[PDB]
Amino acid sequence: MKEGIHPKLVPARIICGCGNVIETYSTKPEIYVEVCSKCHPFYTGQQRFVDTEGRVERFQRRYGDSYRK
């Protein structure tokens, strides 16, 4: 590389919210991030976050069976 135009890369630890620490390289030695691949829903199996719904609708109301036959 040409001298004097490039930000030096040094060993660098990125600290995610799941409490993961990544040993990589950056122009900054230590980084805090809110999320990473280790804890991200799309990555992590299929963590169905807040909606483990099973839809739930629409047949599935069931309040109830009390109308006569």
Binding site: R58, F59, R61, G64, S66, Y67, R68, K69
Partner: protein, 83 residues
């Protein structure tokens, strides 16, 4: 809307007509003047003709249209825009 405590409302006289169709093995058009009626899980797959005030309107009933009333799918007002 109509209280969770009280029943799910269908006019009785439509339900009988539905249930009779279930037994003998369906299916023909059911003329009705019951917009007040809930669509009900046993109604799914029919096509009921609902009155708007002038016309009895064909509504094929589907799985996704279940909690809604009968009149919701037979509109009461003709409107093609202004001018």
């Amino acid at each position: 809307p109509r209280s969770l405590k009280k029943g799910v409302f269908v006019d009785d006289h439509l339900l009988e007509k539905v249930l009779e169709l279930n037994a003998k093995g369906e299916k023909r058009l059911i003329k009705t003047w019951s917009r007040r009626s809930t669509i009900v899980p046993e109604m799914v797959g029919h096509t009921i003709a609902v009155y708007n005030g002038k016309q009895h309107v064909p509504v094929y009933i589907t799985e996704n249209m279940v909690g809604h009333k009968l009149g919701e799918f037979a509109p009461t007002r003709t409107y093609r825009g202004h001018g």
